[PDB]
Write a protein that binds this ligand. Sequence first.
Ligand SMILES: [Fe+3]
Length: 818
Amino acid sequence: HKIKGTVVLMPKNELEVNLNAFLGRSVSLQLISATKADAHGKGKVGKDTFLEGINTSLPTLGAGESAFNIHFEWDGSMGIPGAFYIKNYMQVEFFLKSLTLEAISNQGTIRFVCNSWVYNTKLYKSVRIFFANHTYVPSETPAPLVEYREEELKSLRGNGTGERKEYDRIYDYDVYNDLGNPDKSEKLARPVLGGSSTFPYPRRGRTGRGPTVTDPNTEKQGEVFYVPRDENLGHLKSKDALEIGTKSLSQIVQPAFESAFDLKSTPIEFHSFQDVHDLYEGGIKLPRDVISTIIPLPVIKELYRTDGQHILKFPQPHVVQVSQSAWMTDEEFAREMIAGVNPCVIRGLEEFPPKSNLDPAIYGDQSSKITADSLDLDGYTMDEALGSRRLFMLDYHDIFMPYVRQINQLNSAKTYATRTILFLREDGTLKPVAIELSLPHVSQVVLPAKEGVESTIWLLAKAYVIVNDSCYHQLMSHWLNTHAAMEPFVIATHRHLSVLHPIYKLLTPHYRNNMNINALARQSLINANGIIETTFLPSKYSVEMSSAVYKNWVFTDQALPADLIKRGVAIKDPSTPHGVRLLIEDYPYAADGLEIWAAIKTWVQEYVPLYYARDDDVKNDSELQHWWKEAVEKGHGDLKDKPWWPKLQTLEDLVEVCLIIIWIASALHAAVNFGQYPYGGLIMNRPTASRRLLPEKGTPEYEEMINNHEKAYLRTITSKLPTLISLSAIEILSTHASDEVYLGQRDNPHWTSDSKALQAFQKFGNKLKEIEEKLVRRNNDPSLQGNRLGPVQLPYTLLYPSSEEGLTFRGIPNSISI
Ligand SMILES: [Fe+3]
């Protein structure tokens, strides 16, 4: 007869960085039948129904939320509602949370989970439609809803043309042709990444602003880089809009810092290690007009403590919280390769010497010059060490050698291509035993030393290694393997899986804020003269170097067990719980990771069978098949010919693909992202650039090395000004916003009506709490102190599932959210 409903929404003002106006004829809803169809087979549509009154007597409401009453006339000819249209006649958009229809019983309640911005009706080509929270593979869709389902998908795809506007909900692909700024200056031209065999690259979200005047292949600049509207996350609290901090850092803060150095208001260079420690003790003193430009900015103002006049004070990095000098030890240098910011590059060594795969015609003999007899392996012979699998390496030789010549031509950059040899001691810790520093076209081996000028040469050798590692970490482990690799799957999901689809509901929580942070990164982080180019060694070659590495990116090798085996740090072993035996038993990233991997695997294995009983059902799901086809052939289309792509013809394939996607977006990104300021907030520990080669004997640079090793170090690594910018950047990227959604959580508890899926999700969340307790016990186990805490006394918490807000060195978000 009449159906009572409650609409929950958020006015615009609540999510930026008058309630009676919603009443009257301002907002119309029309219910759509799931069971009665018109003559053309489409669900019957009801009459325009308007919000009747405010509902303050609702206790479930959250911050910024308002609830409205509504009553629908729905007679016996109309059936059961499964969807609704909404039309906003106001001039201002609002954020629609939910619609709930009440019935005589609690089972007869129908829930609509919306979470979508609704703009004025005149801006939309099609009326906004929303579905109830029932889950349906395509063949199970109630017949009267079939055409609505497909038409909404078509609306989300668009036609591949047009400039995208703020309120568009159109997902499509384009190449990375929007990073250069040639119309401003020819020196800001950058290669188009993607769509060629020279520069393969994952696609990003299409924006459609059109060509520059000087280069038809490059996309012109804009003040706002479009993302589909519901990707562009609002926040209740402006301090949680961390993603906009990078834009302010580049466009406002960096020019202000630069002015202070131009005017010689502060020393241009660090002169001692104390000058660096000062940054988080008494602070750095800057002119008042610089401070007054910085501290009124949202987000930016949270990065520093200030006296309001002259002081900016950075927070104390975790890595120096117990020992100011432990970072200099060989033990910590080695330990951070398995428990640091970038713990996933080290490889097992099964032959010696290590060899290069580079073309000898271009580079020279590239056989390693390290000799077995020069190494102190704690009394082991090389034969013994290899055979017991105690030798490991951090090999950046082949990755960097193709670019060293171009980098070293730049004015203030000089680098080597490095290899580091590591030995696994009988006590279970890694020992660095040699570093090889190579140039193309002298190339030196450096051995550990604790005394004399040689100990300084060794300290500098470690710095060149970490410059390699930092660049690889930021551009490859972090930017390429998580942010960039994931965006094509986000695009494909929205274009081809209905909101009704079980796999849409499984994956989309692991996409939150991903396209948004990436678009802001294209604008201010990885663009020409952006933050990365300004602060990291390779300058304008940074992003294209990640294209060279993408040539070898393999989707199925992103699975954690596969990665460990590929790198030779584990072996296949069915006698173990996880199917792999670690060659470095105490390996913190891998040992904790395997626990998280297994819990996600169990969740996916218990969810997929709820909707697919047999391999046939996977093959016959046309949305799933279109989704995976497009993700590979367009989204990662430069690699579409590779044989290792799963074909998605079996349940096992579907589980594997979903598990890998969830892994990349949650635990992998967390493990490489949230340690950036904790380890790298001391620039000497994680230098981002090197500016000169090793001094030659008999030069004043060499004499300086003998008499003042701290100054020799600081002249080698990142200069003070880029240090200040990069520390601010990585402080932002290392912070959890207070509205983060962590692994095992979801934003709405009624995301599906299927009680079976809800219970399996409850079990997943409980397992994560069990694992966190297990990991806590590992960090309290004295036998594992050597690798989990190290000389820096910093327990490895980066894979604890839960976290409070802030710069916490722990917590696994669902998604690539920062
Ligand atoms: Fe990130």
